[PDB]
Structures are given as C-alpha cells and as structure tokens.
Design a binder for this molecule. Sequence first.
Ligand code: 8UI
Ligand code: 8UI
Lengths: 306, 306
Amino acid sequence: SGFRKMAFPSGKVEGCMVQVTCGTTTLNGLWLDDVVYCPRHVICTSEDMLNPNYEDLLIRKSNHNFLVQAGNVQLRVIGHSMQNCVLKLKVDTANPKTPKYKFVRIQPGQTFSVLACYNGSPSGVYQCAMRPNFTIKGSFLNGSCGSVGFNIDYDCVSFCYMHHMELPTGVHAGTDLAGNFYGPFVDRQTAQAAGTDTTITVNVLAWLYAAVINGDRWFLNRFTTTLNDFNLVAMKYNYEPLTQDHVDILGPLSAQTGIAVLDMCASLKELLQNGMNGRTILGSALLEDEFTPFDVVRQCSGVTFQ
Amino acid sequence: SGFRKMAFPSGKVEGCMVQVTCGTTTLNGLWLDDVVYCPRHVICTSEDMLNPNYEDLLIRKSNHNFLVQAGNVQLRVIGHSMQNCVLKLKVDTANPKTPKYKFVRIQPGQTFSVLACYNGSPSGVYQCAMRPNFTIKGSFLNGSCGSVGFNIDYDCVSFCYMHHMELPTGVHAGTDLAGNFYGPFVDRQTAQAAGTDTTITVNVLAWLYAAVINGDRWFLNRFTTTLNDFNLVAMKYNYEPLTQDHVDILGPLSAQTGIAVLDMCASLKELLQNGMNGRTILGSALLEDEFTPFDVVRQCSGVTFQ
Ligand SMILES: *[C@H](O)[C@H](C[C@@H]1CCNC1=O)NC(=O)[C@H](CC(C)(C)C)NC(=O)c1cc2c(OC)cccc2[nH]1
Ligand SMILES: *[C@H](O)[C@H](C[C@@H]1CCNC1=O)NC(=O)[C@H](CC(C)(C)C)NC(=O)c1cc2c(OC)cccc2[nH]1
C-alpha cells in the first residue's frame, strides 16, 4: 500500500539525450536512430527571438553550425530540416540505445513523466499532467528546452512532449514530437498567457478511489446523486464536466472498492461544498487531479515494464 | 521556475535490478559486480515467517536453490552468505552495467529516490524522506522487497535503502545495504508499530524558501523571533527542534532570497498558529517537509548528473 506521484523508470530515455549547440544557444536533443530532435529556437540568438522568421533563419544555417554532443562523443550532422517547431538533425550514427518508440500526442487530463535535462545530461524525473488549458505545471530552468515527456507501455516509449518555454505565470508550454504546440502558444518572445484552467474531475474521482483502496474512508457517505446534479455542482466549482465515458472508465475502480461512481460523486460534491475540515486524503489537504484512472490501477496493482 | 517532487534519473539503478527466486518466494535483488544483494527473508516460506531462525534456515540452503534471473538470462549462484538482514549471492558473472557506487546510511530528514520493482523489473520511480521515526511513506505491494533507495552524486550512486516490509499503518520499513534496519524493526511477522513521528522543521523552512524563489510570498511577514522562542512553538506543534546547524545549512537560501532564517521562522510560527486560511504554497495546502535544503538548491539551480 501507499500512493505516490510516480514517474516511469527513465533509463530508456536517458540513453537518447544529447546536447545541441548552435551559436550561443545550448539545449537538449532527442537522439533516435540517426536523427536528433530539438526545439527549432536553437537556431536563434537573443535579438532574433523577439519575432523570428525560422524558415529564413534555417536556410542561412550549415550542417557544421550544429554541434551535437552525445556525452563525450561528437555526432556529425549530415542534414537538417524543420518540422513545425522542432528541428530534425540527420546524423551519421544511429543511436545504439534507441528503444522501441512512438510519437503520440496526449489529451488534457492525461499524465506523463518528464526527464528534466541540462546540457544533454538528465537532472531529475517527475510526473506531470497536461492541464485542460494545454500547459503543464513543471520544473524547468534556462537550458531545459528539449527535455521530453513520455509514457512507457511494456517496452515501448511513447514520447508525447518536448519542452519549449515558460509562461509568465510560471507554467510551461511545449510541443508534441512532431513539433506542434499544445495549446495556443508560439515559440516567440511575445505576450502569451495560459488561459483559464479547470480541475480534471475524472482524475479527482480516481484519486478518491486510490484513497479508499489505501484505507482513507472518512469522506465517504450514504448519499448519492445523479450525473446531471453532480455536473451542476462541478460547474460552480470550475471542475470540468463528468461524462458517461468517465463513469465507464472508473468502472474497474468502482468494482474493486464496491463504491458506485455516482456515490463517489456525492462524496466529491460534499467535499467541494464543505471542504475537508482540517483532515487529509492520501497526505494531501487538497483534492488532487493529476492521477488518471490508469495511474491509480497501475500503482495500486503493480504493473512493471521491460 | 516551478517546484516538483523530483527523483533522480533511474537508469543506472535499472541496470542492476534482477529477480531472485527461492522456493515459493520471488523478490528483487541488486546486482553489483559479481554479487546480488537481496532481503534474507527470500529463504523463508509462509510458516517459517512467524518467527524465523535465519541462520538455521540458511545452512539448509544450497547455491542451486537460488534462481537469479537477470532479464532473460539466468545467473549461476556460486556462493552465498548472510550479512545482517540481507543475503549476498556470489554469481559467476560481474554485472557489466555496474555503476560507480557506495553503500551509505542516511539520517532521518534526508531524502532519496526509490525505484519500485517487481520480478526484477522496474515499475516506477519516486522521492521519499526518511521520517524521524525511521519509516518511509512509500508505495509498495507484494513482491516489491529488494527495491532500493538511492541518491546520485555526479556519476556515483549512493545506495541507502533496501525494502523489506510494510507496517500496519501503511508505512514502510527497510535496511541499509549492509542489512541493518532503519529503526526498531525486525524482518519477522510480529506486532510492530512505527512509533510517533514529528515534522522535519528544517525541511519545511527549505520548502518555504523554494516557495519564495518561485513567487509565493503571501506568508511572509515583518516580524522575527529568536531561535529559542521558535522552538517553544515547534514543540507545541510536534515539529522537531531547530538547531544552529540547521540555521547554518539554510544560509545559502537565506542569502539568495534576502530573508533571514529567523524571519522565515516567524512566518512558519504564524502558519502554525493560524493555518493557511484557504491559500496554498507551491500547490500544497499543507506544510511540506520532504524537501531538504539541498533538494531545493538542486532544483532551483539546475544540477545534473553524468
Ligand atoms: C529553453 O531552455 C527555455 C526554457 C525556459 C527558460 C526558463 N524556464 C523555461 O522553461 N525556453 C525559453 O527560454 C523560451 C525561448 C523561446 C524562443 C521559446 C521564446 N523563452 C521563454 O520561455 C520566455 C520568454 C518570456 C518572456 O520574455 C522575456 C516574458 C515572460 C515569459 C517568458 N518566457
Ligand atoms: C516483500 O515484498 C514484502 C513487501 C510488503 C508487502 C506489502 N507491502 C510491502 O511493502 N514484505 C513482506 O511481505 C514482509 C515479510 C517479512 C518476512 C519481512 C515479515 N511482511 C510484511 O511486510 C508484513 C506482515 C504483516 C503482518 O502480518 C501478516 C501484519 C501487519 C503488517 C505486516 N507487514
């Protein structure tokens, strides 16, 4: 038992991390087979960065301008091309550590592990959710761009995120690995705001089920509610609506605990209207929404990866 | 910016994880050079486990009784010996993936990363503190014993924890890698309780400094207090005493933020007497105590590891 914010083992991704230097800019790249993927703003300098034209900037570049640095071994760039907001640097060596992988784009509400990197070297690993407003609440400093987010499914690494920027509120924005931003953000230094967020209702319910699985039961009650009556309460508290598909996804957790989904909703409703009265749930004094139903089943059941 | 509970990249440890099977018991082992380390209770069966005599049980064992399983390659055991509560299985192959390492024992209040494993396969990674009562609030299921906790210092892995058991309150107990338990626990199925815990005061103050570094300032105040006057408040709230050495360790964070340590203590004092009044700090509605001063500097500065 116990419930922790758990990231995937990072080893498969650590073997893909390289350093990319162009001009005065150093950032991280992702080396899969004979390609290194990195944010296109590596080709920029501090005054290019107010409003760049990256197509113009890239035709001005040479292969030899890109210093790719894999640990203490330099990789020769033999070609380059831009795909949306990422660069693809073709190198003369395939990465012998390339895992099975996929480039997948995730949905707000879904979680992933981030391997924070500086100078091509991994710094730490942590779990993040894609917020409903397409930001992520990460931990990123100068030089962390090109760090990636990912899930692992048995032996296959599904890359879903490359880091590009921090918004003024201290949240983070980036692209999928095809270079397409999550949300209405651009890789320019202009006035960009996150947009109003909401709480991921289905995840809160998942975490309440994790709590019950772990012996926290004080918030349970005999009441119930309809899906429509719950959603009127969700609106008032800036929780996102709960759909019948969300109810379906929560079925397994409902069955393991014996608590109907709509009964748990009645418990959430009372937690929203009353607060927690000085008590905690799974060591938190807040309703946590960055655990998916999958994350709960995975942790509370013991799935591994090879 | 941002502040997350961050674990170390786990790759160096993943390459050391193996499966150890003896009789009906399967657990995890740690393969460094030509030795596999695992909990000694692998030699037990369900009725041995009420009150074992492990010396008696071990002399009854043969090398060939130990199936060591490194991925899909079997390791031949050529010797065995017990060191306190761990077994040392001598194998005929040195692990080619052995990192630089050390066996270190940590202090309550100190943090480490846990690579949770089942059947020799890594499941997830997360950050834990050693509580003042020598337990850890982890996430562990049947088969997770032999998972290890660790820190990484540049390229060197300091192993500090091997998992052995769960207490009735849902917290976890284990040994250092020399097989010596943290706290007053034994690897027997008898009535064992954790003992009353306290809050790690110096860590809370570190996390308040992380908050300030990240723009959370609402809890700051113009008041100050003496170390003795603060410690009278700490006692009443079951916070552990703050020493001058703790003040010294918090010096760098004090200097970066311009907030004297004792001024932050005055802020903690008011948070303890008043609560947070519906507000949050770094996304938490509780005072967090599982970040050391080092963890804060590491994250808020960007240290990596090779
Ligand atoms: C790449 O390593 C870096 C990562 C951020 C630095 C600090 N935290 C980060 O996550 N990305 C980066 O510096 C962006 C460069 C591009 C070209 C994408 C704009 N810049 C920003 O994130 C950025 C710039 C600004 C400005 O302008 C000064 C104002 C407010 C926020 C902001 N974010
Ligand atoms: C090893 O994989 C296992 C890990 C725990 C299983 C569930 N969560 C864990 O962290 N360790 C294990 O099963 C212990 C075996 C020894 C030989 C060390 C006792 N057993 C326990 O952790 C254990 C046994 C009990 C009992 O007795 C039934 C009562 C309360 C708590 C408890 N913990």
